């Protein structure tokens, strides 16, 4: 039998290939094709800002954070052009409510990231990864860390659990009218999304490239693997939250939390 956990995703990707494609009648064609890559290429190029090595850095640009926020904002268009391209009021309203909770829960990540980039004081990721040399930026900002976790798992990562189903009747999940390779494009997109959120968490909150007694790139890789396993553990443990409870614990609870977080870091930094 297959001994590797990743081999299942490999077989899934192989399976999605070479599947006959049917044309949908009474549907738009340009957005039916373009909506997958707005979800895929966005988090693919979100991988372009990781400091995997000082000598093998994929991009030595001065700003990577703003690019990440630009991808976070862009991601909604995939669910929206998918909703309009569904051309079925059921699926359209399902993608409208999914994009609703998406835009609702995408607010927090920028303001939560302001704390760490303020105690870091720079946008070049070499400065952040060199800042966590002796003390990591996780001890004071517990609330910011959990807020960034919730925001990262809330962007169409299935934690809301309203993507393939709908609590409200008269409407249906928007993953029904896609049955070709686009469904595999969605899965691979959320896969690169979760691994990139984990990588950004380790290299921006914790200390990347430390190397206490072993080479630091495998130290980063193993820490990323442990946080991957913990993310999967809590994703599985996390039960489906109905739409209402998600709306209740959205703008009410974490906007004040991040605002007092900025107040605390600004008061203690000087």
């Amino acid at each position: 039998v297959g001994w590797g956990g990743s081999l299942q995703l490999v077989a899934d990707m192989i399976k999605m290939f070479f599947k006959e494609d049917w044309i949908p009648k009474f549907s738009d064609r340009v957005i039916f094709t373009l909506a997958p890559m707005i979800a895929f290429t966005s988090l693919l190029l979100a991988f372009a800002i990781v400091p995997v090595s000082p000598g093998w850095v994929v991009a030595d640009l001065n700003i990577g954070i703003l690019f990440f926020l630009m991808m976070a904002g862009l991601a909604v268009y995939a669910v929206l052009f998918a909703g309009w391209s569904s051309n079925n009021k059921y699926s359209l309203l399902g993608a409208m409510r999914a994009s609703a909770q998406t835009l609702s829960y995408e607010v927090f990540l920028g303001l939560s990231l302001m704390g760490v980039v303020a105690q870091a004081g720079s946008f070049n990721m070499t400065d952040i990864v060199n800042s966590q040399a002796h003390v990591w930026n996780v001890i004071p900002q517990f609330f910011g860390f959990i807020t960034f976790a919730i925001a990262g798992v809330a962007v169409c990562h299935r934690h809301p659990f309203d993507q393939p189903e709908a609590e409200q009747e008269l409407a249906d999940g928007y993953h029904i009218e896609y049955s070709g390779m686009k469904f595999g494009l969605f899965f691979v997109g959320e896969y690169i999304g979760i691994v990139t959120i984990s990588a950004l968490m380790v290299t921006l909150f914790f200390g990347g490239w430390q190397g206490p007694l072993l080479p630091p790139f495998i130290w980063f890789a193993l820490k990323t693997a442990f946080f991957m396993m913990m993310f999967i553990l809590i994703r599985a443990s996390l039960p489906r939250p109905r739409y209402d409870q998600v709306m209740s614990f959205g703008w009410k609870i974490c906007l004040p939390l991040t605002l007092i977080n900025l107040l605390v870091t600004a008061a203690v930094i000087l």
């Binding site: 297959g2 081999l7 299942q8 077989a11 899934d12 192989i14 399976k15 290939f17 070479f18 599947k19 006959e20 659990f161 393939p164 189903e165 999940g173 993953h175 029904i176 009218e177 896609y178 049955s179 070709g180 469904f183």
Partner: protein, 159 residues
Amino acid sequence: NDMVNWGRKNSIWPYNFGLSCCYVEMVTSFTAVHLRASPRQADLMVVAGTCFTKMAPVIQRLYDQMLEPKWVISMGACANSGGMYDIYSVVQGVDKFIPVDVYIPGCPPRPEAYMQALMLLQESIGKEQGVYRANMQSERERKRGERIAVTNLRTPDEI
């Protein structure tokens, strides 16, 4: 290379069409093997339950919806044939109007029977409905010498 065949053997997506009865054992199986199964995304349809004359067009639309590689498992005596209900209101088997690949007798079958159905269907999917000149061998014929060599069984006055 046959990499495509490995791809199709390794992973399959099940569409559960269990009906009123006979689905509690299927649930017993599914909660051990596994919200992922979704309409218009699956390539495997496990027809179970009594296929009624009234709702058969629904099964024909769901059969039409799936992709080019179509597999069908009939489970239960009520779905393989008419079963015990040889009556005006039941069609005598789902194989009358859709092709079927694997037949799983029982009433209801066991979760292990569902497991053995996945094993025989990956075995069929791994030889390229194609006989490939290998499916003439039958479970009636393959384990025949296994079953005939059984002599003694436990007496039924014990637990």
